[PDB]
Amino acid sequence: WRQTWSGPGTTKRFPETVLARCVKYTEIHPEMRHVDCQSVWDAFKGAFISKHPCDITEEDYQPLMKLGTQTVPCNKILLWSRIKDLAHQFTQVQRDMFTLEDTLLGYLADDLTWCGEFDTSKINYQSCPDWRKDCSNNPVSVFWKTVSRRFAEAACDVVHVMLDGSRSKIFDKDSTFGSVEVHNLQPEKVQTLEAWVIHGGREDSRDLCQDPTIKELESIISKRNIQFSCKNIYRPDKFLQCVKNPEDSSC
Ligand SMILES: *[C@H]1O[C@H](COP(=O)(O)OCCCC)[C@@H](O)[C@@H]1F
Q: Does domain 1-71+99-154 bear CATH number 1.20.82.10?
């Protein structure tokens, strides 16, 4: 009648879903043919089964990271913050740019929740720790931090980030982008971080590249010895029109 934790529990059929996603990914992407999906799942399980779900570490996920090792085109990375759908829509069409969810490990875990229980092999399908209400070192949160760091470390040249220009803080220092990814871009390899600030409906005039939180991001990035650039996407529908058909003479 009562649940242990505040967050949603493990997604139903989690084991089968992860294995099936791995099979599909490794079928489509030829460079991942070497990957044994049962081994990936065993490694994924090993990270959190029989562990207290408030005591997960990045080391727990090391076997999975090793198996899910993947070369990503370093100059074609698209980061995003609080605007998942548009970023994915974009890379679904612009297939030569890659978000974290276009990597094997991001693909496996996208939109899923999982946790175990201490001193029993059971998956908890009733509840899982909420990052804020319960604890930060939980299976889902630790996974995303670990893979997000590794993804940001892979980037080179010009790295792009899609941001939501309709939000209160367009750049949020407390988001995963702001707290993990920005600080793990390697200054030796990354020339520029270019922000694309996506405008909300019909507000097509404000230069959001002058927003205070964008100036904050600019200052943080600049002080890491990386250049900052910013572009408004004033009218998102036209942007979508043009990505989908770039030969369109209106683009
Ligand atoms: C790494 O993190 C980005 C998404 O995180 P957001 O910045 O969306 O943070 C989510 C949690 C907010 C409290 C994306 O580039 C990649 F997945």
A: yes
SS3 189: coil
Resolution attained, angstroms: 1.6
Q: In the PDB record, what is the listed experimental method?
A: X-ray
- The catalytically annotated residue of 37, 115, 135, 156 is 156
How many residues belong to the chain? 251
Cβ(229)–Cβ(195) under 8 Å? yes
Residue 87: phi and psi, rounded to 5, are -60, -45
- Report the 10 Å Cβ neighbour count for 202: 8
Supply the residue whose CA is at minimum distance from atom 5 of ligand 1: 176
Burial of 77 per CB tally in 10 Å (0-12, 13-18, 19+): buried
C-beta of residue 72 within 8 angstroms of C-beta of residue 147: no
Asked if CATH classification 3.90.480.20 holds for the domain at 72-98+155-251, the reply, yes or no, is no
Could you confirm whether 74 is annotated as catalytic?
yes
CA of 177 to the centre of ligand 1 (A): 5
The domains of the chain are located at 1-71+99-154, 72-98+155-251
Residue 11 to residue 26: CA distance in whole angstroms: 22
Contact partners, residue 164, CB within 8 Å, separation at least 6: 81, 82, 83, 170, 198
The C-alpha torsion from 134 through 140 and 141 to 146, rounded to 10°, is 150
Task: Please state, in angstroms and rounded to a whole number, the distance separating the CA atoms of residues 178 and 174.
Answer: 6
